[PDB]
């Protein structure tokens, strides 16, 4: 009946963050994980450049063959390189693929006598307040540099591996995976184009209410959620105008972690479950999908259960703090969705399943389908009220229309 | 240029967290330091009850034998016992003298190459980005476990002793104290009686508007600040006319923790230096020293400095989301002050240091070396802007007219 929060326990930020990496004490072999795209911009460079100025030599490996949606052969394959190579540091540089990828080699470099073919049958249960396998003594540190914002996984014990013979997703529960140190250093954001920006923005602003709303909410991550959602309001529209806005980038890269930091502990909902499956099935944009979802989620959630529920008050506490109308939880619940909808016309997103370029007999041909699915998704278990099956179609035949 | 934000990486919460020390893995050994007021109402007892229900048996030694402001005498005792114990868990449980004292002895048990001499001299430089001995390989877990509400000492790696044979108050810099758990429960804050509910309650309000205003603030640091100053307002008065309340003290007890995530990485200012040094010269309560300053402290860091200044801003923000009037900053600025005194005046607490049994005589006798002193204080480095000598005396005696 007990809560918890966790989070790694040393974030370094601001510019020049990634200089830590000189300083770090204990790191003689590096090994890291990242994708083609790091090494294109020197940002890998950037990383070695750090090493090399330790006192003492600095031997790194460098795995850059990291796929969208890491699969198991990726990740066996990263930890037969680490298990010759050992490392006694493993530096993830990217986004949520390469994060993840690299938390899973992790787990296997660190037990050895751990088999995938288990960890796919246990599931990550919520309630639990303890890991079956927690950080006593670790051969490495893992340290975590994101270069989204963003994802938010640098702060998370999430990993997830897709399987291909098969594609199940399978996030990796009962061991702690946990990153060591985080580097937020928004000099790797410089580079993000303008749509993504946006994408990647409204992620963060989704995992933010998203948390806020939960049922396993609490004093400790309301706070960061509600500041992570103050902070894309103010600065997201201007990293979208224009990316070498250094103030705006430093923002919301800080505002990623810190949704982050929310999420990690307080967890998502349906509108991450919706988003998924939608996502997946019409190839839309993870952030994408999210905003056409929100207007009519939120509208869901804020709707008194069939009969302590709050979630119509705390979605008008966000209206309320956002300055905007909210005398009575109605109308600030109509608020918030009516600020999101500027926002989302500010960043050019689409407003509909149908402006993205999905037909409507080839939306009703999936709707139960993907419906099913989305109630089957693990951050359904955190909605503030469990929905039916039919409360999930009705919720993607409004998003179709669009609002 | 970079900055750092770190906090314990678990922390338990909500009534019974206390039991995680029953699920808590590699744990045979634990050295308990405490008080006779927690020995008193058996919550040592408490604790033991969780570690016998442990699978495996469970040696424990109990160190009660802790007076406020804890000396380095206390501290080598300490570290004799543990020497000899060698414990693999230390559970400090009590309010900051226990937190601080068991932290001094976890830091010689650990590295027993480390001289008190040395350490006097070395200061704290909150400049500094990493731990000259951070933790990397202990023999020995801390859990910090709070029993007031609250100096906030379970998440920071700040640890004072006093010497005595000179009196000078000395934090230890270099080594990483940070606890590795910290176990806030409210069960042991139900029992705090109601004067001090209020001074420990106001100092969670102080640690959390200083930390706000801080020059070290950053947005991590400000979303814990502006909850747990919200949380303040909404349930510190009901804490007080009511200690059985239950929601009132678990969320004061939150607020206390959430505070200290706050200024264990954004730091204070002139507020507890002007504190620290009244309330040892004139033995006024901490928390009730912080009250009769604040009016004056905020007025004065809200002053545009002689002549980038946010203070005033930043005190306006607050009012703001307090729902205060705040249509301009300064009138904002005045609101926040005017919210604090009617608090203040709800807890029956005095709003001068005349109110207190200070003599007019008394004080402008002393006002010259305590207002040296404060300035003097570690605290004052991370003070919005930086104040004269003559500064904090026109405070100290705006502070005894009173407001
Ligand atoms: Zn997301
Ligand atoms: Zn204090």
Known sequence: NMQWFKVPPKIYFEKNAVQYLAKMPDISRAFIVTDPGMVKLGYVDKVLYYLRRRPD???????????????????????????????????????????????????FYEHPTADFNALKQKFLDIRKRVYKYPKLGQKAKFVAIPTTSGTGSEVTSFAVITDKKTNIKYPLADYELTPDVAIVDPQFVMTVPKHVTADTGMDVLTHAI????????????????????????????????????????????????????????????????????????????????????????????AAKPKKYFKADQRYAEIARMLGLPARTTEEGVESLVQAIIKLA??????????????????FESKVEKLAELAFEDQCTTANPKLPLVSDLVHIYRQAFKGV
């Not at 795995?63 to 969208?68: G, I, N, Q, T």
């Not at 390189?81 to 787990?107: C, H, N, Q, T, Y």
């Not at 396993?216 to 201007?238: C, H, S």
């Open 57 to 107: 030599y600095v031997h790194s490996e460098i795995f850059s063959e990291v796929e969208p949606d890491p699969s198991i052969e990726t990740v066996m394959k990263g930890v037969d390189m680490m298990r010759s190579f050992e490392p006694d540091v493993i530096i993830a540089l990217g986004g949520g693929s390469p994060m993840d990828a690299a938390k899973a080699m992790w787990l």
């Open 210 to 301: 998203e948390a806020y709303v939960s049922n396993m909410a609490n004093d400790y991550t309301d706070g960061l959620a509600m500041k992570a959602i103050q902070l894309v309001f103010e600065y997201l529209p201007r990293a979208y105008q224009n990316g070498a806005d250094e103030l705006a980038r430093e923002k919301m890269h800080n505002a990623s972690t810190i949704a982050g930091m929310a999420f990690a502990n307080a967890f998502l909902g349906i509108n991450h479950s919706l988003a998924h499956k939608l996502g997946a099935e019409f190839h839309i944009p993870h952030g994408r999908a999210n905003t056409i979802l929100m207007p009519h989620v939120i509208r869901y959630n």
């Open 345 to 362: 016309k500010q960043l050019d997103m689409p407003l509909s399943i149908e402006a993205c370029g999905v037909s409507k007999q080839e």
